């Protein structure tokens, strides 16, 4: 039940991780960081600071909160 | 979006 990455607990540090986030992924760094996700610097691949859950292949129409919660129901952040 | 490990 532990926070997987406390260095990314800050929402501002998650936002700063989004250098070179690609245009095709459609979702914004603001929306993704607010749902607890930070950029791993590879493709559109993000990870949660809380559950360590990894998400990729983002599509227009996805919601960062909704994808995060539906795939990681154990996550305390989006619970 | 798709989870992965
Ligand atoms: Zn999570």
Q: Which candidate, B2, A35, B5, places its Cα nearest to that of A57?
A: B2
Question: Residue A68 Cα, ligand 1 centroid: separation in angstroms?
Answer: 6
Domain boundaries, chain A: 1-79
Right CATH for A1-79 from 1.10.1170.10, 1.20.1630.10, 3.60.20.10, 1.10.3720.10: 1.10.1170.10
Which residues lie closer than 8 Å to A27 by C-beta, 6 or more apart?
Answer: A58, A62, A64
Please list, residue by residue across A37-61, b when 16 or more beta carbons sit within 10 angstroms of its beta carbon and e when fewer do. bbbeeeebbbbbbbbebbbbebeee
Resolution (Å) of this entry:
2.1
Q: Which residues of A fall within a CB distance of 8 Å from B4? A: 45, 54-56
Q: Which residues of A fall within a CB distance of 8 Å from B3? A: 53-55, 71-72
Tokens of A5: 């990455």
Distance CA A18, CA A27 (A): 11
Cβ burial, residue A15 (10 Å; 0-12/13-18/19+): middle
């Amino acid at each position: 039940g532990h926070m997987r990455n406390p260095a990314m607990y800050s929402e501002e540090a998650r936002l700063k991780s989004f250098q070179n986030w690609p245009d095709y992924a459609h979702l914004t760094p603001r929306e993704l960081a607010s749902a607890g996700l930070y950029y791993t610097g590879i493709g559109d691949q993000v990870q949660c600071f809380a559950c360590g859950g990894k998400l990729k292949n983002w599509e227009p129409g996805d919601r960062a909160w909704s994808e995060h919660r539906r795939h990681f129901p154990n996550c305390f952040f989006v619970l | 979006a798709x989870p992965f490990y």
